[PDB]
mmCIF file with all atom_site columns, C-alpha atoms in Angstrom:
data_model
loop_
_atom_site.group_PDB
_atom_site.id
_atom_site.type_symbol
_atom_site.label_atom_id
_atom_site.label_alt_id
_atom_site.label_comp_id
_atom_site.label_asym_id
_atom_site.label_entity_id
_atom_site.label_seq_id
_atom_site.pdbx_PDB_ins_code
_atom_site.Cartn_x
_atom_site.Cartn_y
_atom_site.Cartn_z
_atom_site.occupancy
_atom_site.B_iso_or_equiv
_atom_site.pdbx_formal_charge
_atom_site.auth_seq_id
_atom_site.auth_comp_id
_atom_site.auth_asym_id
_atom_site.auth_atom_id
_atom_site.pdbx_PDB_model_num
ATOM 1   C CA . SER A 1 1   ? -89.403 -115.761 48.401 1.00 12.97 ? 5   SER A CA 1
ATOM 2   C CA . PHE A 1 2   ? -90.799 -112.465 46.826 1.00 12.80 ? 6   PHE A CA 1
ATOM 3   C CA . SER A 1 3   ? -94.533 -112.299 46.034 1.00 12.98 ? 7   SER A CA 1
ATOM 4   C CA . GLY A 1 4   ? -96.866 -109.902 44.280 1.00 13.87 ? 8   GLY A CA 1
ATOM 5   C CA . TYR A 1 5   ? -94.188 -108.261 42.122 1.00 11.29 ? 9   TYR A CA 1
ATOM 6   C CA . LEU A 1 6   ? -94.742 -106.996 38.612 1.00 12.34 ? 10  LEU A CA 1
ATOM 7   C CA . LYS A 1 7   ? -91.905 -108.101 36.292 1.00 14.95 ? 11  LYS A CA 1
ATOM 8   C CA . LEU A 1 8   ? -90.447 -105.087 34.416 1.00 14.30 ? 12  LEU A CA 1
ATOM 9   C CA . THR A 1 9   ? -87.453 -106.767 32.747 1.00 12.18 ? 13  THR A CA 1
ATOM 10  C CA . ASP A 1 10  ? -85.551 -110.083 32.916 1.00 11.49 ? 14  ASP A CA 1
ATOM 11  C CA . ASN A 1 11  ? -84.110 -109.039 36.324 1.00 10.38 ? 15  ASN A CA 1
ATOM 12  C CA . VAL A 1 12  ? -86.080 -106.049 37.655 1.00 11.11 ? 16  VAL A CA 1
ATOM 13  C CA . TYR A 1 13  ? -89.344 -106.508 39.593 1.00 10.80 ? 17  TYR A CA 1
ATOM 14  C CA . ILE A 1 14  ? -91.530 -103.870 41.280 1.00 10.50 ? 18  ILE A CA 1
ATOM 15  C CA . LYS A 1 15  ? -94.244 -103.796 43.957 1.00 12.22 ? 19  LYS A CA 1
ATOM 16  C CA . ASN A 1 16  ? -96.242 -101.130 45.821 1.00 11.54 ? 20  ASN A CA 1
ATOM 17  C CA . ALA A 1 17  ? -95.013 -102.011 49.296 1.00 9.82  ? 21  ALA A CA 1
ATOM 18  C CA . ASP A 1 18  ? -93.480 -100.620 52.438 1.00 11.79 ? 22  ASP A CA 1
ATOM 19  C CA . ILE A 1 19  ? -89.848 -101.853 52.228 1.00 12.92 ? 23  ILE A CA 1
ATOM 20  C CA . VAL A 1 20  ? -89.782 -102.329 56.063 1.00 11.03 ? 24  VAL A CA 1
ATOM 21  C CA . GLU A 1 21  ? -92.865 -104.574 55.967 1.00 9.52  ? 25  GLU A CA 1
ATOM 22  C CA . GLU A 1 22  ? -91.504 -106.313 52.892 1.00 8.66  ? 26  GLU A CA 1
ATOM 23  C CA . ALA A 1 23  ? -88.146 -106.941 54.594 1.00 9.98  ? 27  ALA A CA 1
ATOM 24  C CA . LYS A 1 24  ? -89.824 -108.254 57.775 1.00 8.27  ? 28  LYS A CA 1
ATOM 25  C CA . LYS A 1 25  ? -91.935 -110.641 55.661 1.00 8.91  ? 29  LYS A CA 1
ATOM 26  C CA . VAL A 1 26  ? -89.293 -111.942 53.206 1.00 6.20  ? 30  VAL A CA 1
ATOM 27  C CA . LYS A 1 27  ? -86.181 -111.654 55.443 1.00 6.43  ? 31  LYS A CA 1
ATOM 28  C CA . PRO A 1 28  ? -84.135 -111.311 52.207 1.00 5.86  ? 32  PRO A CA 1
ATOM 29  C CA . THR A 1 29  ? -80.385 -111.896 51.979 1.00 9.47  ? 33  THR A CA 1
ATOM 30  C CA . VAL A 1 30  ? -79.938 -108.191 51.182 1.00 7.06  ? 34  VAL A CA 1
ATOM 31  C CA . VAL A 1 31  ? -82.069 -105.165 51.852 1.00 7.80  ? 35  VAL A CA 1
ATOM 32  C CA . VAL A 1 32  ? -80.791 -101.906 50.344 1.00 8.22  ? 36  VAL A CA 1
ATOM 33  C CA . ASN A 1 33  ? -80.873 -98.766  52.413 1.00 9.89  ? 37  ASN A CA 1
ATOM 34  C CA . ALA A 1 34  ? -81.139 -95.312  50.844 1.00 8.43  ? 38  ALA A CA 1
ATOM 35  C CA . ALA A 1 35  ? -78.174 -94.115  52.892 1.00 7.48  ? 39  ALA A CA 1
ATOM 36  C CA . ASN A 1 36  ? -76.301 -90.836  53.127 1.00 5.70  ? 40  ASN A CA 1
ATOM 37  C CA . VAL A 1 37  ? -72.463 -90.620  53.358 1.00 4.73  ? 41  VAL A CA 1
ATOM 38  C CA . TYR A 1 38  ? -72.601 -90.289  57.154 1.00 3.52  ? 42  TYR A CA 1
ATOM 39  C CA . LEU A 1 39  ? -74.981 -93.251  57.610 1.00 2.71  ? 43  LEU A CA 1
ATOM 40  C CA . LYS A 1 40  ? -77.256 -90.901  59.591 1.00 2.18  ? 44  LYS A CA 1
ATOM 41  C CA . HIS A 1 41  ? -80.576 -92.731  59.186 1.00 4.13  ? 45  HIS A CA 1
ATOM 42  C CA . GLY A 1 42  ? -82.870 -89.867  60.022 1.00 6.89  ? 46  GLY A CA 1
ATOM 43  C CA . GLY A 1 43  ? -85.713 -89.931  57.532 1.00 7.62  ? 47  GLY A CA 1
ATOM 44  C CA . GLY A 1 44  ? -87.122 -91.513  54.390 1.00 3.85  ? 48  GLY A CA 1
ATOM 45  C CA . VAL A 1 45  ? -86.299 -95.172  53.840 1.00 2.75  ? 49  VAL A CA 1
ATOM 46  C CA . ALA A 1 46  ? -83.214 -94.968  56.106 1.00 2.00  ? 50  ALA A CA 1
ATOM 47  C CA . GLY A 1 47  ? -85.159 -93.575  59.056 1.00 2.00  ? 51  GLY A CA 1
ATOM 48  C CA . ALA A 1 48  ? -87.837 -96.215  58.573 1.00 2.00  ? 52  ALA A CA 1
ATOM 49  C CA . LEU A 1 49  ? -85.374 -99.140  58.296 1.00 2.00  ? 53  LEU A CA 1
ATOM 50  C CA . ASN A 1 50  ? -83.422 -97.875  61.287 1.00 3.39  ? 54  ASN A CA 1
ATOM 51  C CA . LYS A 1 51  ? -86.587 -97.446  63.414 1.00 2.59  ? 55  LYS A CA 1
ATOM 52  C CA . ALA A 1 52  ? -87.556 -101.069 62.547 1.00 2.00  ? 56  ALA A CA 1
ATOM 53  C CA . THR A 1 53  ? -84.171 -102.220 63.972 1.00 2.00  ? 57  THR A CA 1
ATOM 54  C CA . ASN A 1 54  ? -84.877 -100.321 67.256 1.00 2.00  ? 58  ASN A CA 1
ATOM 55  C CA . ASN A 1 55  ? -81.877 -98.068  66.366 1.00 2.00  ? 59  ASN A CA 1
ATOM 56  C CA . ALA A 1 56  ? -79.454 -101.035 66.174 1.00 2.00  ? 60  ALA A CA 1
ATOM 57  C CA . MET A 1 57  ? -78.711 -100.043 62.549 1.00 2.00  ? 61  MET A CA 1
ATOM 58  C CA . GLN A 1 58  ? -77.710 -96.528  63.679 1.00 2.00  ? 62  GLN A CA 1
ATOM 59  C CA . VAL A 1 59  ? -75.495 -97.845  66.519 1.00 2.00  ? 63  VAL A CA 1
ATOM 60  C CA . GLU A 1 60  ? -73.727 -100.208 64.104 1.00 3.09  ? 64  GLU A CA 1
ATOM 61  C CA . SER A 1 61  ? -73.462 -97.430  61.494 1.00 2.00  ? 65  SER A CA 1
ATOM 62  C CA . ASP A 1 62  ? -71.906 -94.938  63.920 1.00 2.00  ? 66  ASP A CA 1
ATOM 63  C CA . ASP A 1 63  ? -69.222 -97.501  64.805 1.00 2.00  ? 67  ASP A CA 1
ATOM 64  C CA . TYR A 1 64  ? -68.646 -98.108  61.050 1.00 2.00  ? 68  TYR A CA 1
ATOM 65  C CA . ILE A 1 65  ? -68.228 -94.332  60.424 1.00 2.00  ? 69  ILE A CA 1
ATOM 66  C CA . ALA A 1 66  ? -65.966 -93.898  63.470 1.00 2.00  ? 70  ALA A CA 1
ATOM 67  C CA . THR A 1 67  ? -63.662 -96.577  62.004 1.00 2.00  ? 71  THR A CA 1
ATOM 68  C CA . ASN A 1 68  ? -63.900 -95.892  58.258 1.00 2.00  ? 72  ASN A CA 1
ATOM 69  C CA . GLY A 1 69  ? -65.090 -92.346  57.764 1.00 2.00  ? 73  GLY A CA 1
ATOM 70  C CA . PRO A 1 70  ? -67.905 -91.370  55.441 1.00 2.00  ? 74  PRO A CA 1
ATOM 71  C CA . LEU A 1 71  ? -68.914 -93.229  52.316 1.00 2.00  ? 75  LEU A CA 1
ATOM 72  C CA . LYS A 1 72  ? -68.601 -91.612  48.893 1.00 2.00  ? 76  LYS A CA 1
ATOM 73  C CA . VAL A 1 73  ? -71.745 -90.432  47.055 1.00 2.00  ? 77  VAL A CA 1
ATOM 74  C CA . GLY A 1 74  ? -72.317 -93.375  44.667 1.00 2.00  ? 78  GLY A CA 1
ATOM 75  C CA . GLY A 1 75  ? -70.673 -95.790  47.118 1.00 2.00  ? 79  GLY A CA 1
ATOM 76  C CA . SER A 1 76  ? -71.879 -98.409  49.530 1.00 2.00  ? 80  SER A CA 1
ATOM 77  C CA . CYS A 1 77  ? -71.050 -100.609 52.431 1.00 2.00  ? 81  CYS A CA 1
ATOM 78  C CA . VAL A 1 78  ? -72.424 -103.938 53.646 1.00 2.00  ? 82  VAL A CA 1
ATOM 79  C CA . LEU A 1 79  ? -73.547 -104.019 57.242 1.00 2.00  ? 83  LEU A CA 1
ATOM 80  C CA . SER A 1 80  ? -75.908 -106.266 59.237 1.00 2.00  ? 84  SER A CA 1
ATOM 81  C CA . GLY A 1 81  ? -79.526 -106.550 58.147 1.00 2.00  ? 85  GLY A CA 1
ATOM 82  C CA . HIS A 1 82  ? -80.511 -106.894 61.853 1.00 2.00  ? 86  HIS A CA 1
ATOM 83  C CA . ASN A 1 83  ? -84.125 -108.171 62.121 1.00 2.00  ? 87  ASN A CA 1
ATOM 84  C CA . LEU A 1 84  ? -84.901 -107.189 58.512 1.00 2.00  ? 88  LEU A CA 1
ATOM 85  C CA . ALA A 1 85  ? -82.463 -109.121 56.343 1.00 2.00  ? 89  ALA A CA 1
ATOM 86  C CA . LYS A 1 86  ? -79.146 -111.058 56.487 1.00 2.00  ? 90  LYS A CA 1
ATOM 87  C CA . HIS A 1 87  ? -77.313 -107.906 55.279 1.00 2.00  ? 91  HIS A CA 1
ATOM 88  C CA . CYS A 1 88  ? -78.087 -104.313 54.635 1.00 2.00  ? 92  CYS A CA 1
ATOM 89  C CA . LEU A 1 89  ? -76.383 -102.787 51.634 1.00 2.00  ? 93  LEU A CA 1
ATOM 90  C CA . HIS A 1 90  ? -76.214 -99.065  52.472 1.00 2.00  ? 94  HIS A CA 1
ATOM 91  C CA . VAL A 1 91  ? -76.069 -97.309  49.126 1.00 2.00  ? 95  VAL A CA 1
ATOM 92  C CA . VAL A 1 92  ? -75.583 -93.548  48.711 1.00 2.00  ? 96  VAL A CA 1
ATOM 93  C CA . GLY A 1 93  ? -77.434 -92.152  45.759 1.00 2.00  ? 97  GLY A CA 1
ATOM 94  C CA . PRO A 1 94  ? -76.884 -88.446  44.923 1.00 2.00  ? 98  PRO A CA 1
ATOM 95  C CA . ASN A 1 95  ? -79.125 -86.111  46.878 1.00 2.00  ? 99  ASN A CA 1
ATOM 96  C CA . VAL A 1 96  ? -80.411 -83.531  44.402 1.00 2.00  ? 100 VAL A CA 1
ATOM 97  C CA . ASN A 1 97  ? -81.564 -81.379  47.361 1.00 2.00  ? 101 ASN A CA 1
ATOM 98  C CA . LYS A 1 98  ? -77.760 -81.059  48.263 1.00 2.00  ? 102 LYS A CA 1
ATOM 99  C CA . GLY A 1 99  ? -76.735 -80.258  44.610 1.00 2.00  ? 103 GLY A CA 1
ATOM 100 C CA . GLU A 1 100 ? -75.108 -83.682  44.117 1.00 2.00  ? 104 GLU A CA 1
ATOM 101 C CA . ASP A 1 101 ? -74.377 -84.850  40.580 1.00 2.00  ? 105 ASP A CA 1
ATOM 102 C CA . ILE A 1 102 ? -77.373 -86.916  39.300 1.00 2.00  ? 106 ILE A CA 1
ATOM 103 C CA . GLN A 1 103 ? -74.792 -88.709  37.041 1.00 2.00  ? 107 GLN A CA 1
ATOM 104 C CA . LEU A 1 104 ? -73.662 -90.506  40.277 1.00 2.00  ? 108 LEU A CA 1
ATOM 105 C CA . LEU A 1 105 ? -76.982 -92.425  40.324 1.00 2.00  ? 109 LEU A CA 1
ATOM 106 C CA . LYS A 1 106 ? -75.596 -94.999  37.845 1.00 2.00  ? 110 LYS A CA 1
ATOM 107 C CA . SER A 1 107 ? -72.512 -95.532  40.081 1.00 2.00  ? 111 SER A CA 1
ATOM 108 C CA . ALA A 1 108 ? -74.854 -95.962  43.067 1.00 2.00  ? 112 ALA A CA 1
ATOM 109 C CA . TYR A 1 109 ? -76.890 -98.660  41.248 1.00 2.00  ? 113 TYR A CA 1
ATOM 110 C CA . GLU A 1 110 ? -73.673 -100.464 40.192 1.00 2.00  ? 114 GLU A CA 1
ATOM 111 C CA . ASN A 1 111 ? -73.265 -101.478 43.856 1.00 2.00  ? 115 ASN A CA 1
ATOM 112 C CA . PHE A 1 112 ? -76.323 -103.747 43.432 1.00 2.00  ? 116 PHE A CA 1
ATOM 113 C CA . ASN A 1 113 ? -74.394 -105.898 40.917 1.00 2.00  ? 117 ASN A CA 1
ATOM 114 C CA . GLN A 1 114 ? -72.263 -107.312 43.735 1.00 2.00  ? 118 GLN A CA 1
ATOM 115 C CA . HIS A 1 115 ? -75.371 -109.136 45.119 1.00 2.00  ? 119 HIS A CA 1
ATOM 116 C CA . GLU A 1 116 ? -77.307 -111.858 43.276 1.00 2.00  ? 120 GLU A CA 1
ATOM 117 C CA . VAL A 1 117 ? -80.667 -110.731 44.683 1.00 2.00  ? 121 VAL A CA 1
ATOM 118 C CA . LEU A 1 118 ? -81.747 -107.595 46.543 1.00 2.00  ? 122 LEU A CA 1
ATOM 119 C CA . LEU A 1 119 ? -84.851 -105.977 48.015 1.00 2.00  ? 123 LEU A CA 1
ATOM 120 C CA . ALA A 1 120 ? -84.407 -102.237 47.318 1.00 2.00  ? 124 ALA A CA 1
ATOM 121 C CA . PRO A 1 121 ? -85.966 -98.831  47.130 1.00 2.00  ? 125 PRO A CA 1
ATOM 122 C CA . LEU A 1 122 ? -85.500 -96.533  44.094 1.00 2.00  ? 126 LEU A CA 1
ATOM 123 C CA . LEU A 1 123 ? -82.213 -94.738  44.718 1.00 2.00  ? 127 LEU A CA 1
ATOM 124 C CA . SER A 1 124 ? -82.252 -90.959  45.036 1.00 2.00  ? 128 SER A CA 1
ATOM 125 C CA . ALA A 1 125 ? -86.068 -90.940  44.997 1.00 2.00  ? 129 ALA A CA 1
ATOM 126 C CA . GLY A 1 126 ? -88.213 -89.494  47.845 1.00 2.00  ? 130 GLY A CA 1
ATOM 127 C CA . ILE A 1 127 ? -86.412 -87.039  50.091 1.00 2.00  ? 131 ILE A CA 1
ATOM 128 C CA . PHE A 1 128 ? -83.254 -87.399  47.936 1.00 2.00  ? 132 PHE A CA 1
ATOM 129 C CA . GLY A 1 129 ? -85.029 -85.268  45.313 1.00 2.16  ? 133 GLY A CA 1
ATOM 130 C CA . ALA A 1 130 ? -84.445 -87.113  42.044 1.00 5.03  ? 134 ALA A CA 1
ATOM 131 C CA . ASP A 1 131 ? -87.195 -88.019  39.574 1.00 4.57  ? 135 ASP A CA 1
ATOM 132 C CA . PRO A 1 132 ? -88.218 -91.623  40.468 1.00 6.40  ? 136 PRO A CA 1
ATOM 133 C CA . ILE A 1 133 ? -89.038 -92.344  36.779 1.00 8.05  ? 137 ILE A CA 1
ATOM 134 C CA . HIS A 1 134 ? -85.397 -91.506  35.962 1.00 8.70  ? 138 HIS A CA 1
ATOM 135 C CA . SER A 1 135 ? -84.206 -93.632  38.937 1.00 7.09  ? 139 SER A CA 1
ATOM 136 C CA . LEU A 1 136 ? -86.155 -96.659  37.648 1.00 9.87  ? 140 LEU A CA 1
ATOM 137 C CA . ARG A 1 137 ? -84.693 -96.150  34.153 1.00 9.67  ? 141 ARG A CA 1
ATOM 138 C CA . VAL A 1 138 ? -81.129 -96.031  35.555 1.00 9.57  ? 142 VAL A CA 1
ATOM 139 C CA . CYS A 1 139 ? -81.912 -99.089  37.702 1.00 11.30 ? 143 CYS A CA 1
ATOM 140 C CA . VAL A 1 140 ? -83.115 -101.144 34.708 1.00 11.20 ? 144 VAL A CA 1
ATOM 141 C CA . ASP A 1 141 ? -80.181 -100.005 32.564 1.00 6.43  ? 145 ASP A CA 1
ATOM 142 C CA . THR A 1 142 ? -77.516 -100.608 35.269 1.00 6.36  ? 146 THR A CA 1
ATOM 143 C CA . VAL A 1 143 ? -78.491 -103.474 37.542 1.00 4.98  ? 147 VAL A CA 1
ATOM 144 C CA . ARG A 1 144 ? -77.963 -106.938 36.075 1.00 4.41  ? 148 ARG A CA 1
ATOM 145 C CA . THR A 1 145 ? -78.667 -108.916 39.271 1.00 5.52  ? 149 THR A CA 1
ATOM 146 C CA . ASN A 1 146 ? -82.218 -109.654 40.531 1.00 7.65  ? 150 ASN A CA 1
ATOM 147 C CA . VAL A 1 147 ? -83.648 -106.509 42.098 1.00 4.90  ? 151 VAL A CA 1
ATOM 148 C CA . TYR A 1 148 ? -87.071 -106.377 43.796 1.00 6.93  ? 152 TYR A CA 1
ATOM 149 C CA . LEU A 1 149 ? -88.111 -102.758 44.066 1.00 8.91  ? 153 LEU A CA 1
ATOM 150 C CA . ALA A 1 150 ? -90.481 -101.676 46.797 1.00 4.90  ? 154 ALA A CA 1
ATOM 151 C CA . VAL A 1 151 ? -92.258 -98.367  46.040 1.00 7.57  ? 155 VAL A CA 1
ATOM 152 C CA . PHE A 1 152 ? -94.101 -97.057  49.087 1.00 8.60  ? 156 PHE A CA 1
ATOM 153 C CA . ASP A 1 153 ? -96.377 -94.544  47.361 1.00 7.94  ? 157 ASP A CA 1
ATOM 154 C CA . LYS A 1 154 ? -99.307 -96.240  45.338 1.00 6.32  ? 158 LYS A CA 1
ATOM 155 C CA . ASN A 1 155 ? -99.724 -93.195  43.093 1.00 7.08  ? 159 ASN A CA 1
ATOM 156 C CA . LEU A 1 156 ? -95.989 -93.147  42.272 1.00 5.80  ? 160 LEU A CA 1
ATOM 157 C CA . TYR A 1 157 ? -96.012 -96.959  41.761 1.00 2.00  ? 161 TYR A CA 1
ATOM 158 C CA . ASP A 1 158 ? -98.866 -96.622  39.232 1.00 2.00  ? 162 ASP A CA 1
ATOM 159 C CA . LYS A 1 159 ? -97.068 -93.768  37.446 1.00 2.00  ? 163 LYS A CA 1
ATOM 160 C CA . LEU A 1 160 ? -93.809 -95.810  37.319 1.00 2.00  ? 164 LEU A CA 1
ATOM 161 C CA . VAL A 1 161 ? -95.548 -98.896  35.873 1.00 2.00  ? 165 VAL A CA 1
ATOM 162 C CA . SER A 1 162 ? -97.788 -97.002  33.415 1.00 2.00  ? 166 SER A CA 1
ATOM 163 C CA . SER A 1 163 ? -94.874 -94.936  32.041 1.00 2.00  ? 167 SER A CA 1
ATOM 164 C CA . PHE A 1 164 ? -92.313 -97.796  31.876 1.00 2.00  ? 168 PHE A CA 1
#
């Protein structure tokens, strides 16, 4: 199970960790990917998770898009977790750097409520351009299931904990 996490609330936990290394260690039931609507896992968390699967996540994702079309911003899909987890929940948070409505971040986090426990990054943080402090606030106020947040950056992790 999950180790070294700081408990923020009854159901939200946080750790300064690389989500790829965390996933390879825990092999959780669900790892969340910070996906885009096209499931093009180029950079950030998505690029890192996909690289850890030796591109198997991208091959599976391209077949999913060919069949279903793009996801909605705020939406998700469950695909294989490959060598990282049983499943990967690909969740699309709004990308502020594309002018997407930050109000969609709550809808994005609501996808986590369909899973009893998840290993996840902060949605819309990093290259998605949102304020990670705001993302953590929306996470705590939206997710009711057990979410283990992995924050890659130590300095951001310390800021998130100290300002919580």
